Amino acid sequence: SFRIEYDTFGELKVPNDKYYGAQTVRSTMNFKIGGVTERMPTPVIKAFGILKRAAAEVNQDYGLDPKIANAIMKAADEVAEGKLNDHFPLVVWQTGSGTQTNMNVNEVISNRAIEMLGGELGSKIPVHPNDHVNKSRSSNDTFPTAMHIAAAIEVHEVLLPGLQKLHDALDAKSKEFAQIIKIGRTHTQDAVPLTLGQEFSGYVQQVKYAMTRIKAAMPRIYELAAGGTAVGTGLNTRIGFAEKVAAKVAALTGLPFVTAPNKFEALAAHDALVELSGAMNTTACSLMKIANDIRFLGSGPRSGLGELILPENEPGSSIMPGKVNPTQCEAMTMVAAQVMGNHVAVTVGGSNGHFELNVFKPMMIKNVLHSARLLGDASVSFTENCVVGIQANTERINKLMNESLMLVTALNPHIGYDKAAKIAKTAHKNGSTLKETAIELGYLTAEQFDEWVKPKDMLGPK
Amino acid sequence: SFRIEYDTFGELKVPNDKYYGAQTVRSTMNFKIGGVTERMPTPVIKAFGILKRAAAEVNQDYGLDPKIANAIMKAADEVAEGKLNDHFPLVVWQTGSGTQTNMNVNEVISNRAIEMLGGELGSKIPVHPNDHVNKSRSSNDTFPTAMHIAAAIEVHEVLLPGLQKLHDALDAKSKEFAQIIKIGRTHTQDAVPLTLGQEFSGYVQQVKYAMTRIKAAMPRIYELAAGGTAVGTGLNTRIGFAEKVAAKVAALTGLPFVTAPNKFEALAAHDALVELSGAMNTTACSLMKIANDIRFLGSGPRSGLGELILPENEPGSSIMPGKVNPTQCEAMTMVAAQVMGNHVAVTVGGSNGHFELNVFKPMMIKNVLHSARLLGDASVSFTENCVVGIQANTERINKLMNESLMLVTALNPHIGYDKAAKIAKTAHKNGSTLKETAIELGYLTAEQFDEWVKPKDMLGPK
Amino acid sequence: SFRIEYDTFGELKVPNDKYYGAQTVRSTMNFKIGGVTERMPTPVIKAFGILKRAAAEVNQDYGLDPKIANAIMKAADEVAEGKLNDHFPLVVWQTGSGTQTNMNVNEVISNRAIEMLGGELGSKIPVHPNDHVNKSRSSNDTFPTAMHIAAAIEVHEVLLPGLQKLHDALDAKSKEFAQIIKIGRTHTQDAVPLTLGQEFSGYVQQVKYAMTRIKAAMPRIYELAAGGTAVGTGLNTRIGFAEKVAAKVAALTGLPFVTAPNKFEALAAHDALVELSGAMNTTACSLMKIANDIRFLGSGPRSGLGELILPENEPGSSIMPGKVNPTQCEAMTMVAAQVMGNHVAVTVGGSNGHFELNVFKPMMIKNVLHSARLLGDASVSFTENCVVGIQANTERINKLMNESLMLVTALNPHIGYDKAAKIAKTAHKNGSTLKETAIELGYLTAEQFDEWVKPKDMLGPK
Amino acid sequence: SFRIEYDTFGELKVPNDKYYGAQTVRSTMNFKIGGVTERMPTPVIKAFGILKRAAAEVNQDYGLDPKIANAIMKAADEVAEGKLNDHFPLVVWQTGSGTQTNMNVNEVISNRAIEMLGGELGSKIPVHPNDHVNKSRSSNDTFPTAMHIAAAIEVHEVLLPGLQKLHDALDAKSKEFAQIIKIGRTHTQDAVPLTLGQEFSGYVQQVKYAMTRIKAAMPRIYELAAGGTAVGTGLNTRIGFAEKVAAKVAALTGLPFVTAPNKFEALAAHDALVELSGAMNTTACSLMKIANDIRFLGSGPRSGLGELILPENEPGSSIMPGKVNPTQCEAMTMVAAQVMGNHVAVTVGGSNGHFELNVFKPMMIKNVLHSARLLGDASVSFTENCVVGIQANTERINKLMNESLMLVTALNPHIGYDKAAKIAKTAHKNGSTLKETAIELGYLTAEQFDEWVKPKDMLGPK
Ligand SMILES: [Cl-]
Ligand SMILES: [Cl-]
Ligand SMILES: [Cl-]
Ligand SMILES: [Cl-]
């Protein structure tokens, strides 16, 4: 069931059905921290597949045999496509440079490429893990490169598409609710009116600004450390490799990847991950506000606010109609709280670089990818399972509109401030409506009230 | 105008009316960071006066002249009593050990004692700042000692008394509201009933647990670093000074101060400050919930929840007689958010100690004292200007109780689940009450409804 | 391959080899957030098994048929023992009350118990998911109970045992290094000496205080919400159930679980999780200091500090001897940064409770369990793979001791301050040792220097 | 002594020498939270003076009397110029909308303009606080406008100029150190060489990227809420006032202020403040790395790293001539930790908006301005008192270069990997240099070593 390999610490049995080698096995034994929920995120593994596929191509310009290079390229493609996920057992909580995952990727790609060429698994023949798969002689620049490839792909494929669906759904609701006038709330107190569409337009602007903030953090993420090698000097790599491998990654992904103008800044720190995490942290604040507002606007049905009727996803009780738990709102606000904590973890790691190398890399990219996946997935779920199905309780909204004390300022240019203040003061102490009190005081007639108190005329400046 | 003093780097103009000296003026010149709001917190200055008073009394056992020592004690008492606050212009953003503030205290106490002994300001005669006020030869242990004295005093005098007032006022409201039954809210949806007194009893328990958590963080605060000198070995200090000066501080303050059992842990880290900030962070989560709940329970008056009538302390618009903004709730929740941020700042500083000395001390104690003062002051303000004056809107609470669909399960044993659920669904569809629907359906009488649906019987287990 | 079940939203195919039902399947479709790394943590599932096993026993006092109860108890045991982990596919990012995992547990236990009694899977006969497995009529108190059971078990079984191993290993190193005098470092500058054992004794005290801080947060974790039902009143549960099920959980686990004195505080907030997260946050600051110190103390071999020789776990290069990357230090400091971020996520969720129910429960317990597992696992790995094998570079330590300028204060009670200051001032500008300069200046002889400059006499007060 | 003013709750004694009125005195009485260090930041007060000056000029287009308007403009100019700071005693911990500070500004400007028009203080004649100074009928939009004006001005005048000085000084050191080759450090272990100029060029890039990130956060800061009035509809304000007052603020400040495109997003949330705090949080991670690196590179002089000689600005002990504590590094890293905590506080406030108004405004702008002032001031102080005066210890750097084992790979093409690794292992075992070992082994001459091992040839790709 196993083959037998050796490192400088002793004998190791590697399962025959695994493409990793003795380096990966030893790493798994030395870092038993967290369990399988702590394995290196799949986007990082796939990004390594893209990077090795790109380097193998470029390395043909530097002596790499085309028959070996093509075998590496096909094996790297299988990694980048998620076909070999079960051959990467390492946890995030490894070395701070992530080079143990780099050696995991080198072992898997060479062994798979060896098998494609009919060789013996574990022999390093004819595809060597270091001499061929890592022909670039890259070391501490590999994992930084895979971090930015994975972050850029996850932002383009998961985060922004999810937020775009949320933006469009909120915008459709805003237009659908454009003519429903409701009582505003400031300090949670009754305030002058606005429409549900105006309130939802604020949500739309927040999501629009969130997508702009995330895009503004991407230019630095597109800068790749590949070519810096050990300390950023580029020692042991070939001239032109840094630019060529970045341009190849750009062509493989369709994203505007470039080489980092300063490789020492690219290895010694990961401020671009901190800035991207900061944009997602701002997005979390926007989504917390939006989801909590809709949570409260749908509260009820009779002892809450009751403005919105949210779609029911979980089965209720036949004895409890009208009760709809805002469960998509709860999942979204929990995600937002998680992103804020993830950002602090990213911040602590990003601040603790030492000299030529920041060695908090796996934890930083884990929290960045975690935040991006959660925000993208929750935005999709929030959209499809709640936002698109939100209905307005227009009957309740219009009833509370006529019973509110907030429309009384519409009578000031008819009966003066103090007569209007006395109608509101009396109606408050009496539990009566504004119209009922304005007539019982003999200040105006009903036909005058309906002519002067028009809420559609209180939605903008004059 | 000025007197002229000298350090070995040149000459310095010291204002004639100031008790600080050349080293303080040199320190102000090199750390122009933040402005006057960033000056060292007054509790730290006062704590230094306590410490120097204690050291001078103890140092008589090791040869300090009694007339010099008694002048130092009187001058240090003036520092501890807050009479010399304008003689400490240094900001928090100084050296990470805080020894520049230690020298500020040495110069002020020496010059003030010189003045009380008829000498000339700045002469170091007959009271020398280092040889007499700092005769203990302490250095890197002075500021840690002053931190823990200041934190313990602020907890004992401000934080815990403020929370005690809040606890007692909430308990009084709980008893006052013990018979007011209202509709519960889970997920912000209508739920089975409970009393306002039961709900408030939850807040009472949170404040009770908050005080227990803060008290649990104090034993390590009471451990003083005084006696560790430069690196924790106690080099250049006298055997027994550490225990004696701690006992003198205990007798002066009435708080159970003892010497730190391990001086290296006391200088290299300030985990006790992190744990105390953590307890205040937990307290902030409690106060955020309590204050936010009261904010929303008082929302309205007509489109909010409207269960509570909060006191109106600042005048509002006469045109708006029903609006009472919960401004005390807003100050409390803003304070809670500030404590959470302050805790992260304490955490980053606490994590970044280097070898024998953590040099983040001034920023750590600044945030700890900030959180304690804000939490204590806000609790007092929230208590006096909101909690004690809260009234229940029993008229609205009773009306919404009768209109709620949540009481329908009381009919289950009398008419069966199927008929009860039919009453609930028809009442929800028609916008009618359970009683109206149950009789229009011929399922029971009005007399059977009044006898079977008793909310006072739905407040506990059977 | 499937059976066919129905909910109120349509037909659902449930795999025959799964014990969950249509409720779990529908929940999996409505909350596609995060992937399989986001599944509910295993300690929560096992804790549900303990809770249901305990309730099934107690419910025999309330009519539950002993033949059904015993079937439930054996099925719950299989859950609590980790035999049915593959039947829980729900993610953390579900409803904020965690009741969808509660229904997942109810479906699995009843279906497995049905199979133990030879029934048809998915029939609810003779073991009903609600009528029998959830006979307590518990709702919003189930997940809070499982949270505290899981947290208490993880602290007792993983966190504290891991820290205890670290404490003992650091203590052994402290005693082993008790006689190795080295130059201290304050502000990273050369300071007066101390021993490696004294420096390591500070680490020991930090870990000891960390275990005390975690234990101090446990009394409130031991309080269980079981019995509060929907809003904390205990409506629909039987008198005495809350106390009995807590005492049964205590007997099943061997831990001092009790019922919560105030069930409204137990449902509306999770301040005990915030306080436990705060204790782990303080522990993270201690471990960050300890691991970073050892990281830097082992730096070198020739351009660093070079005081410690750390064990080599990853294979190096045969051309690069003496290079040992402190990879266990990096994994530990990354874990510490992750705990600090997790604490903020816990803090945000714990602060956002609404009225009768905090609906951030799954996210809060996920981050608490994550922090406890990481700290416990990393402490074990740090201990076994680094601390126990640390060696001291006594040759380098003694060489820098004799070349340091820091021992010059030992000559002040022989030649006075100013003669000693001139030896240090000259030796600094000359690149010479203190003894070489003291003789070249003719201030003392060699035999006098060795008699007066004794570093073993500079390790404590006099 | 005092004058007597009146609100509708009673009478208030206003000090004779103060320009504030009854509403300010009422506000101070009800919010005794924090003390004088907690007063509203001066940049917010000054920004209010700018805003009121702008509104008064624009309001002439809507009928405001020119002589009244010109008196308001002159009084508002005195507020903006910092001449009336002692007339604003309100703390940050007030109402969450900040309207109490808005009224403070209205009363001060009205009373000062009354004084300039010969009237009596407190008379509201001829300049009324609400009818004239607040003629725009703005309310909940005033403080948000003042926040963004204050943040934009502090970024333009303090933060960015401070970072610009730091960038330029670091760039100058990078050029000055361009030929000094030293041993690199990855994982704090000795690594392949690089120049001090290359290492410093990494810091230069981080500061350059920090300024780009902060500038990227400004477009949404430049959007002003002025014109949204109570809920964002703009009710009670004039059409065109929003655009005109923003254009007037732009002309007065020279900054590209525009009106917010969506006033509901502008009042209900302050995500722009969260994004700007995020950029400052990223900057803090950069400065923490830069300052901590320089701290450790200057450590020593004899048991540290010793590569840099930092300037000595405060006198030290003459007995300790080689000790120079990096106090500017400590103030910078303490500031960086404070910014990270401030960011969490901003985040919690930004996430907790309710419906039409976020009522965490004063605490959010307090932390934003605190971070900007500290970062700007510290960057200037760190630049002038440390960076510009840094010297390289080239003697020590060159000695450690020759003693390092990291240059051995330069022998690989000339003698082979196996002999080169033997030289490295023997030099490491003997405590000797590569050159000494290579010749005692008969592997090469001293002349071959000098010609083959050229560190200037190991600073880039081949
Ligand atoms: Cl590569
Ligand atoms: Cl002292
Ligand atoms: Cl149960
Ligand atoms: Cl205005």
Residues A8, A11, A13: CA angle, nearest 5 degrees: 130
Looking at residue C360, what DSSP letter applies? Answer: -
B249: how many CB neighbours lie within 10 A of its CB? 27
DSSP line for A329-396: HHHHHHHHHHHHHHHHHHHHHHH--BTTB---HHHHHHHHHHHHHHHHHHHHHHHHHTGGG-EE-HHH
* Residues from chain D contacting residue B35 (CB–CB below 8 Å): 373
Longest CA–CA separation in chain C, Å: 102
Q: Report CA A53 to chain centroid distance, whole Å.
A: 27
b (16+ CB within 10 A) / e for B261-288: ebbbbbbbbbbbbbbbbbbbbbbbbbbb
CB contact at 8 A, C191 and B139:
no
Q: Residues with Cβ < 8 Å from A332, sequence gap 6 or more?
A: A287, A288, A291, A378, A379, A381, A382
CA distance B389 to B373: 24
CA distance C441 to C439: 5
- Report how far ligand 3's centroid is from the alpha carbon of C109 (Å): 11
Radius of gyration of chain B (CA): 30
Q: Is C224 helix (H, G, I), strand (E, B) or coil?
A: strand
Q: Is A190 on the interface with B (CB under 8 A)?
A: yes
Query: Which sign, positive or negative, has the C-alpha torsion C207, C209, C210, C215?
Result: positive
Q: To which residue do tokens 């507020």 refer?
A: D79
* Residues from chain B contacting residue D338 (CB–CB below 8 Å): 345, 363, 367
Does the annotation count C299 as an active-site position?
no
* Residues from chain D contacting residue B31 (CB–CB below 8 Å): 327, 331, 381
CA distance C185 to C180: 15
Query: Which sign, positive or negative, has the C-alpha torsion C198, C203, C206, C210?
Result: negative
CA distance C255 to D315: 59
CA distance D40 to D45: 7
C154: how many CB neighbours lie within 10 A of its CB? 24
Q: Which of B130, B106, B123, B128 is nearest to B45 (CA)?
A: B106
Question: Are the beta carbons of B188 and A351 separated by less than 8 Å?
Answer: no
Q: Which two tokens stand for residue A46?
A: 């796939």
Question: Are the beta carbons of B377 and D9 separated by less than 8 Å?
Answer: no
CA distance D368 to B253: 37
Which of D235, D237, D287, D408 is most worth mutating to test chain A (most A CB atoms within 10 A of its CB)?
A: D235
Q: Which of D375, D368, D151, D357 is nearest to D257 (CA)?
A: D151
CA distance D225 to D263: 6
b (16+ CB within 10 A) / e for A317-351: eebbbbbbbbbbbbbbbbbbbbbbbbbbbbbbbbb
Which residues in chain A are immediately followed by a break of C to N over 2.5 Å?
Answer: none
Chains that touch A (3 or more CB pairs under 8 A): B, C, D
Q: Is C254 on the interface with B (CB under 8 A)?
A: no
Q: Given B174, B187, B299, B381, which residue is catalytic?
A: B187
Q: Report CA D359 to chain centroid distance, whole Å.
A: 24
Question: In this complex, how many residue pairs, one in chain B and one in chain D, have their CB atoms less than 8 Å apart?
Answer: 180
Q: Residue B194: enclosing H or E segment and its boundaries?
A: strand B189-195
Looking at residue A127, what DSSP letter applies? Answer: S
CB contact at 8 A, C382 and C332:
yes
CA distance to partner chain B, nearest, from residue A294 (Å): 11
Q: Report CA C251 to chain centroid distance, whole Å.
A: 25
Q: Which two tokens stand for residue A27?
A: 């790493």
b (16+ CB within 10 A) / e for A192-209: bbbbbbbbbbbbbbbbbb
3-state secondary structure chain D: CEEEEEECCEEEEEECCCCCCHHHHHHHHHCCCCCHHHECCHHHHHHHHHHHHHHHHHHHHHCCCHHHHHHHHHHHHHHHCCCCHHHCCCECCCCCCCHHHHHHHHHHHHHHHHHHCCCCCCCCCCCCHHHHHCCCCCCCCHHHHHHHHHHHHHHHHHHHHHHHHHHHHHHHHHHHCCCCEEEEEECCEEEEEEEHHHHHHHHHHHHHHHHHHHHHCHHHHCEECCCCCCCCCCCCCCCCHHHHHHHHHHHHHCCCCEECCCHHHHHHCCHHHHHHHHHHHHHHHHHHHHHHHHHHHCCECCCCCCCEECCCCCCCCCCCCCCCCCHHHHHHHHHHHHHHHHHHHHHHHHHCCECCECCCHHHHHHHHHHHHHHHHHHHHHHHHHCHHHCEECHHHHHHHHHHCCCCHHHHHHHHCHHHHHHHHHHHHHHCCCHHHHHHHCCCCCHHHHHHHCCHHHCCCCC
Looking at residue C48, what DSSP letter applies? Answer: H
B446: how many CB neighbours lie within 10 A of its CB? 11
CA distance to partner chain C, nearest, from residue B282 (Å): 6
Q: Is B326 on the interface with A (CB under 8 A)?
A: yes
Question: Are the beta carbons of C96 and A337 separated by less than 8 Å?
Answer: no
Q: At what resolution in Å was this solved?
A: 2.3
Question: Are the beta carbons of C33 and A378 separated by less than 8 Å?
Answer: yes
Which amino acid, residue B398? N
DSSP line for B287-339: HHHHHHHHHHHT-BSSSS---EE----S---TT-TT----HHHHHHHHHHHHH
Question: Are the beta carbons of A269 and D206 separated by less than 8 Å?
Answer: yes
Q: Residue B364: enclosing H or E segment and its boundaries?
A: helix B361-385
Of the CA atoms within 13 Å of residue B76, those in its CB half-sphere come to 26
C315: how many CB neighbours lie within 10 A of its CB? 13
Q: To which residue do tokens 């040869």 refer?
A: B63
CA distance to partner chain C, nearest, from residue D107 (Å): 37
Q: Is B359 helix (H, G, I), strand (E, B) or coil?
A: coil
- Report how far ligand 4's centroid is from the alpha carbon of D131 (Å): 10
Looking at residue A311, what DSSP letter applies? Answer: P
Q: Are strands A258-259 and A223-224 parallel, antiparallel or unpaired?
A: parallel
CA distance to partner chain A, nearest, from residue D271 (Å): 6
b (16+ CB within 10 A) / e for C370-380: bbbbbbbbbbb
Q: Is B238 on the interface with D (CB under 8 A)?
A: no
Q: Given B110, B201, B317, B351, which residue is catalytic?
A: B317
- Alpha carbon of D401 to those of A264, C195, D188, D398, D417: distances in Å? 20, 30, 16, 5, 21
Q: Is D299 on the interface with C (CB under 8 A)?
A: yes
Q: Is C304 on the interface with A (CB under 8 A)?
A: no
Chains that touch C (3 or more CB pairs under 8 A): A, B, D
Question: Are the beta carbons of A351 and B351 separated by less than 8 Å?
Answer: no
Partners of C259 in the beta sheet? C224
Radius of gyration of chain C (CA): 30
Percentages of chain A per state (helix, strand, coil), in multiples of 5: 60, 10, 30
Q: To which residue do tokens 């991006």 refer?
A: A372
Query: Which sign, positive or negative, has the C-alpha torsion A42, A47, A53, A55?
Result: negative
Query: Which sign, positive or negative, has the C-alpha torsion C63, C64, C70, C74?
Result: negative
A404: how many CB neighbours lie within 10 A of its CB? 24
Binding residues of A for substrate: 97-99, 128-131, 138-140, 186, 318, 323-325
* Residues from chain D contacting residue B37 (CB–CB below 8 Å): 37, 39, 41
Does the annotation count C187 as an active-site position?
yes
Looking at residue A302, what DSSP letter applies? Answer: S
CB contact at 8 A, B363 and D337:
yes
Q: Is B346 on the interface with D (CB under 8 A)?
A: yes
CA distance B23 to A96: 43
Radius of gyration of chain A (CA): 30
Query: Which sign, positive or negative, has the C-alpha torsion C152, C156, C157, C163?
Result: positive
Which amino acid, residue B407? L
* Residues from chain D contacting residue C320 (CB–CB below 8 Å): 405-406, 424
Question: Are the beta carbons of B186 and C231 separated by less than 8 Å?
Answer: yes
Q: To which residue do tokens 């002020």 refer?
A: B108
Residues of D tagged active-site: 187, 317
* Residues from chain C contacting residue D296 (CB–CB below 8 Å): 188, 296
Helices (H), C155-195: 160-176
Q: Residue B401: enclosing H or E segment and its boundaries?
A: helix B394-403
Question: Are the beta carbons of A404 and B303 separated by less than 8 Å?
Answer: yes
CA distance to partner chain B, nearest, from residue D296 (Å): 10
Residues of A tagged active-site: 187, 317
CA distance D367 to D270: 13
CA distance D298 to D310: 6
Of the CA atoms within 13 Å of residue C401, those in its CB half-sphere come to 19
Looking at residue A411, what DSSP letter applies? Answer: G
For residue C140, report the phi and psi dihedrals to the nearest 5 degrees.
-80, 0
* Residues from chain A contacting residue B188 (CB–CB below 8 Å): 295-296, 298-299, 304, 326
- Report how far ligand 1's centroid is from the alpha carbon of A137 (Å): 7
